[PDB]
Design a protein around this nucleic acid. Structure first.
Lengths: 95, 104, 81, 93, 92, 106, 79, 96
DNA sequence: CAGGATGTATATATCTGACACGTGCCTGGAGACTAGGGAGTAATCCCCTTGGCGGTTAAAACGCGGGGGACAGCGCGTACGTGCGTTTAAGCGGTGCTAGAGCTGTCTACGACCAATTGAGCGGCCTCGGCACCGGGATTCTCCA
DNA sequence: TGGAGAATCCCGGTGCCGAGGCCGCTCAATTGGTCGTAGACAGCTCTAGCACCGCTTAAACGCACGTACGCGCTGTCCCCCGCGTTTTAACCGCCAAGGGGATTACTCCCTAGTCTCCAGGCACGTGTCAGATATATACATCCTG
């Protein structure tokens, strides 16, 4: 009857995309979901305060761009901004 | 036709944009920000499972135990730097023995 | 009163010691580690009770345990759901 | 008996395994008594009391990492209680 | 239009120490501490309202955010001070 | 007519009310909360300033400069545990020298 | 030559602030190592923080939030 | 002539009272500007922004230096050899 | 102990730029009035916490005995501390400009609010293969002679 | 040096339950529509941040050397490791009981939003005196005695 939201199938078929012959425990997906929620809250709060002290009412792509560059260590950061910019460009090229 | 289909991604953007509205981080959210939000967290889950999957073949087990994600972070300096203030439950500590402690 | 603070036992700090990589341990280590564990649990269950008291509940659940640790900069995974 | 053989044996099998060290009910009967100081007639969820347990040892096995570094800095292999008085003052509490 | 907290803490200082002065550099120490403990207890109250799916901030709810963030003796005296400051407010 | 005079403090309710509104902490906030929050900074300002004037008194200086606020936070054991994560500009350090360094037979 | 702008009696002045009677000679190149890492990690964050405001002077305002992200929030110059 | 180490504690009680900023200012002007221009080109600095950096950096140094002081006392030694500094970063968690 | 030799604390003369107070305009605080939804209250039900009891057996507790590390002391070699002269450029004061932050004002595209349409997503239930467990044998290796 | 026993690794089967995946159901995502306002853009203003230039002046820099302090050697002693024995109580699994969390339902106040007006807080400006500095004095240290 209740509704509890989860990213279980999301990380499940992400793992089936990268390693299609590997299984995952439900406990392991619980660390996966908690870690994902933690980094989500971190990047969203960083972008929120970065938009707040810039007197801006909107989080565009540039705010979360600079917040990702703030929160992530160097080579992982540059790979992440490259791939996310690729995804953003692919989104705006299509309808 | 979901927004993740036109982005070509696999994490949903309609979920992420939903908690960007009622999440009170700001009252107005731009269009590309939840798309950019979904894309970054595509990497951060996939960075773990290939490291967990590499350690899965090292132990030769076709299931991922909470041991495996513990060594998927702690053996990498770029991942230990970010995840230094958080413990992982029932994963233990990677084996490390100091050289002066060793005999002979 | 009772033996609750020394309910943890002489091999119990021994087992956590070998996971912590030491070679030789002392006998007067032991009652101090009970104080250190208590004073860390003094600061943690204080925050979990105050979250329980705000939520109009008299049972401390699994989640408000976690954000007491997230307050302390010692956040935990696997029980945030 | 074997001198030093079982000393280096337990440290390898504990840094490899995942099994818990802090015993359940003497931890479970302790957490009721400290919560009794604050509020009377308290209830605890089964996952709640368990979540404190590996919260506690993961501090302590991280704390025992620090006291081991203190022991070698004094050119010794035995840990005195002043090593715990060392690392807590160094790391900020 | 650079606004600050310059006048308010000056009235507090003349209330307790009516023959003492405070430098402008000490003012910026005093202003920035208040601004940090603006957003600290307000920030912890900001999350905790969401944490039990409650969208309205009450005077009862911010009370708990005081008791989390400051230690023992100062925590007990601040809640008892603010309660008598607010019970006389609702009577008038 | 002033809301602070109806509450009897010094930090104004309305300035606190609009910043806790515009600082997007929640969609719906109450009216008693900006009353109460201004009081908890009032007690915190009363605590720091009492030790500040105490530090000004024994240094025989009638102007409070950031050295005395450093004396005001470091000496009391409690509020260092609140805010010892915070550095102070132009504050200085605690006078503290360990006794094992000090020479004997003097 | 500009890297050596931190000067050797001033390292003693931090060390004589340290309350220690004797200082070894290999401290001075060591503390250049550990402190130049530290101020690197503060303008790693503050410079791109300045870049976000379409802004090409690092003011005293934007830096204070950068150490607050690192966790050593500082007083005296606003914030 | 003074016995060596006694004017070290005589210089202590001057430095305990003082709050004046320790290392020189415009030597610190050059050293933070050279790594900034090496980071991104054409970067300027407000004068109080570098004044936000010195008491950020002397606060790192002397809070580390009392911290390795009580570490070096634990070795029953007065001189700080650099293996304390690697340990102080190790215990605080900033390095490993 | 101990006299002398200085580094630190004291003391008033003074002086200057920050500090406390005054004007007034002006923009946010406050009073008023309506709307409608967040939450107060309450009733129910069902997880789920607590309690208990007894067989089992893994593990705690204690004692004893030795062998190896803690530490006190020693001895030596050397690495800075105090001092003095030497070289450097820190820092102050002044001019100047010019690059860029802030202000101002008009606009338009983008995101907020809303109705409907429905397929992604989810709780539950069935199924079987991976994996831990029981048991037996090969493989090291460190202490004993 | 060998040898013998204590532990570790692995191999074969197995029974179990935890992952996995389908199945019917539903609620938030999506599509289509509008409106205004937040951000973007561009042009002007003026403040501040580089930026050379001399001056004098504390402070850095190099050298010297003695001494006490850092590092290796070593003997002792007891305390801590390490086994065997006895003791302790933990673990699973069985059943009872109810307590309070979570859900559904109903209304009402009280805060969000507009409208309107009023004063207290903030930019500018002022004049003054507190502590920074300064140079002579006590005093309370330490050094060779």
């Amino acid at each position: 009857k209740t509704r509890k939201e989860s990213y279980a199938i999301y990380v499940y078929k992400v793992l089936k995309q990268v390693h299609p012959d590997t299984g995952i425990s439900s406990k392991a997906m619980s660390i996966m979901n908690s870690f994902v929620n933690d980094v989500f809250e971190r990047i969203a709060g960083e972008a929120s305060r970065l938009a707040h002290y810039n007197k801006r009412s909107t989080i565009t792509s540039r705010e979360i761009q600079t917040a990702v560059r703030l929160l992530l260590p160097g080579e992982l950061a540059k790979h992440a901004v490259s791939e996310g910019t690729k995804a953003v460009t692919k989104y705006t090229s299509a309808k | 036709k979901t927004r993740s289909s036109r982005a070509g991604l696999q994490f949903p953007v309609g979920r992420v944009h939903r908690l960007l509205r009622k999440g009170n981080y700001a009252e107005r959210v731009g269009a590309g920000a939840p798309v950019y939000l979904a894309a970054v967290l595509e990497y951060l889950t996939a960075e773990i499972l290939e490291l967990a999957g590499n350690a899965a073949r090292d132990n030769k087990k076709t299931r991922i135990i909470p041991r495996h994600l513990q060594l998927a972070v702690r053996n990498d300096e770029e991942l230990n730097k970010l995840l230094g203030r958080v413990t992982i439950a029932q994963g233990g500590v990677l084996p490390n023995i100091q050289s002066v402690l060793l005999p002979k | 009163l009772r033996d609750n603070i020394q309910g943890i036992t002489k091999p119990a700090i021994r087992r956590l010691a070998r996971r912590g990589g030491v070679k030789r341990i002392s006998g007067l280590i032991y009652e101090e580690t009970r104080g250190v564990l208590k004073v860390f649990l003094e600061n943690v269950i204080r925050d979990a009770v105050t979250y329980t008291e705000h939520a109009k509940r008299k049972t401390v659940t699994a989640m408000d345990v976690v954000y007491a640790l997230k307050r302390q900069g010692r956040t935990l995974y696997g029980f945030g759901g | 008996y074997r001198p030093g053989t079982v000393a280096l044996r337990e440290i390898r099998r504990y840094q490899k395994s995942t099994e818990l060290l802090i015993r359940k009910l003497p931890f479970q009967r302790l957490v009721r008594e400290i919560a009794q100081d604050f509020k009377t007639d308290l209830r605890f969820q089964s996952s709640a009391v368990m979540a404190l347990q590996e919260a506690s040892e993961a501090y302590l096995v991280a704390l025992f990492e620090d006291t081991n570094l203190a022991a070698i800095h004094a050119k010794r292999v035995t840990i005195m209680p002043k090593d715990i008085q060392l690392a807590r003052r160094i790391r900020g509490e």
